[PDB]
Amino acid sequence: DQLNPESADLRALAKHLYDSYIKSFPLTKAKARAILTGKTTDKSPFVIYDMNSLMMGEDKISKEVAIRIFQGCQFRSVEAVQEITEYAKSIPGFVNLDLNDQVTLLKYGVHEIIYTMLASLMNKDGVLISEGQGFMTREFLKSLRKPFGDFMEPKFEFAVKFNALELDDSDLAIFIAVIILSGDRPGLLNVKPIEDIQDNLLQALELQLKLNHPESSQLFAKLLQKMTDLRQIVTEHVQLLQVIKKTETDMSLHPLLQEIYKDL
Ligand SMILES: COc1cc(CCc2ccccc2)c(C(=O)O)c(O)c1CC=C(C)C
């Protein structure tokens, strides 16, 4: 039989992470795909695709429209940062790390994770919003005044590609744990304890994918290669925020987000 004690421990680790992910993230990929695909009469989103539907959306779900949307987006990111911080504490070994490194791991990790999980809420046509009650189209977003009309496009581009891996939540739980425990983060005090945890997470992810996706060759490698896409989305996003700060000096940014962005 395949399972030995070592691979048994990796299965127990996969199970624990999946459990913690479910407990930390109220809107899973499974729920998102059920809303998006019409496993539904109770789960249908209201669709925002223009100014009028936007106005009607606000009714059923003050400033300039681009700004309201961007701020709505900032607030959800703050929520996601909180959910991800709750999840991270569940990753075995994580809270036993030097407090400074915990902060560093989160600071550089959370945006990569946000866009990973945001892919679960996207298809080629738009993105779920407000806990799945709404769906805002990609074209509507793209139509926003400069520079806001461009903020979401690289996220959709990534999501379309990432979604072709067809990962489910149990896969993603291990993958986002791997992301958080990156020993290559800038300013880390003790890299070794992080690398040892990541090594364990990596073995767990490898096994999960082999078992969950037996006909999907080199999926593990293909998934690791996606980290390059995420890192690049994050860099572009930060650059676009520097532009927004200067053109929209009357627009405030959540300090939790501001501290994350500080010298990324
Ligand atoms: C465009 O990106 C939005 C925007 C929004 C704001 C949608 C909105 C704002 C203001 C008026 C009408 C609709 C939400 C939301 O409200 O849940 C959202 O989850 C997202 C997903 C984005 C993330 C997690 C970065």
UniProtKB/Swiss-Prot annotation:
Changing residue 23 to R: More than 50% loss of ubiquitination. Induction: (Microbial infection) Expression increases when incubated with M.tuberculosis or its lipoprotein LpqH; induction is TLR2-dependent (at protein level). GO terms for molecular function: alpha-actinin binding; arachidonate binding; chromatin binding; DNA binding; DNA binding domain binding; DNA-binding transcription activator activity, RNA polymerase II-specific; DNA-binding transcription factor activity; DNA-binding transcription factor activity, RNA polymerase II-specific. GO terms for cellular component: chromatin; cytosol; intracellular membrane-bounded organelle; nucleoplasm; nucleus; receptor complex; RNA polymerase II transcription regulator complex. Highest expression in adipose tissue. Lower in skeletal muscle, spleen, heart and liver. Also detectable in placenta, lung and ovary. Keywords: Activator, Biological rhythms, Cytoplasm, Diabetes mellitus, Disease variant, DNA-binding, Glycoprotein, Isopeptide bond, Metal-binding, Nucleus, Obesity, Phosphoprotein, Receptor, Transcription, Transcription regulation, Ubl conjugation, Zinc, Zinc-finger. Residues 1-51 are annotated as: Interaction with FAM120B. There is a cross-link at residue 23 (Glycyl lysine isopeptide (Lys-Gly) (interchain with G-Cter in ubiquitin)). It is found in: Nucleus; Cytoplasm. The 9aaTAD motif is a transactivation domain present in a large number of yeast and animal transcription factors. Interacts with FOXO1 (acetylated form). Heterodimer with other nuclear receptors, such as RXRA. The heterodimer with the retinoic acid receptor RXRA is called adipocyte-specific transcription factor ARF6. Interacts with NCOA6 coactivator, leading to a strong increase in transcription of target genes. Interacts with coactivator PPARBP, leading to a mild increase in transcription of target genes. Interacts with NOCA7 in a ligand-inducible manner. Interacts with NCOA1 and NCOA2 LXXLL motifs. Interacts with ASXL1, ASXL2, DNTTIP2, FAM120B, MAP2K1/MEK1, NR0B2, PDPK1, PRDM16, PRMT2 and TGFB1I1. This is Peroxisome proliferator-activated receptor gamma. The gene is PPARG. The chain holds residues 230 to 504 of 505 of the full protein.
